[PDB]
Amino acid sequence: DYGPHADSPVLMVYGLDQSKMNCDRVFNVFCLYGNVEKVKFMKSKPGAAMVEMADGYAVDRAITHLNNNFMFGQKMNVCVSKQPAIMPGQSYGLEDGSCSYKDFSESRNNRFSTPEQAAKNRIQHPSNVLHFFNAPLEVTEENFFEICDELGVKRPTSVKVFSGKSERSSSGLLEWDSKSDALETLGFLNHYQMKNPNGPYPYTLKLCFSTAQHAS
């Protein structure tokens, strides 16, 4: 095991904004510590929500190191709750085109989405270096620069890319470190769609923290 542990599988957050922080950005910032279960916005506020995860060891990780950090200049308010799960209610579309409620328990894109794989993998605090996977075999550092240009986020200081044989995909590392620049890029570059106009081919790639000493 690593670090302390939470007392609940659920948490709550305020001060966010539905135009740059919603169910997809909270999934991109909390899922790299354990698979998320479901999320909902609460009391009809554009700046209040609640989240649940598959285990409390992932809730503890965002509580111990993601706490009081924000992305896109928002003021930080976050706490843990004693509720057993996210509760049902009415839902509607946000201005970002996503729903006020979402689920992620059906995801298989993580090495901890099942208790048999979560027993051969670990969760750890940030390592000032990131890693990416499941990208197409045609991606390069120049493609990461032209996507960060449409997201307005900061570009990495170094890049590492490698394509697998007969796997038709690419994986690698990215190296840069700042609080607001690494958290904004994580929330908008994770699970993101390429510059293609009709999406005739997939490009969605995952992001997470990895223990590295260089981008090679």
How was it solved? NMR
Cα 202 from Cα 196, distance rounded (Å): 9
Q: List helix spans (H) across 6-73.
A: 23-30, 56-61
Output the CA–CA distances (angstroms, integers) from residue 2 to 33, 37, 52, 96, 161, in the order listed.
12, 22, 20, 36, 29
Per the structure block, which two tokens stand in for 89? 């209610």
* Encoded amino acid at 179, one letter: K
What is the DSSP secondary structure assignment for residue 66, as one 8-state letter?
Answer: I
Tokens of 151: 């997201």
First to last CA, the chain: 28
- Domains in the chain: ranges and CATH: 1-105 (3.30.70.330), 116-216 (3.30.70.330)
Sequence-ordered list of residues with C-beta below 8 angstroms from that of 21, at least 6 positions apart, any chain: 71, 72, 74, 187
Residue 111, both tokens = 């090495």
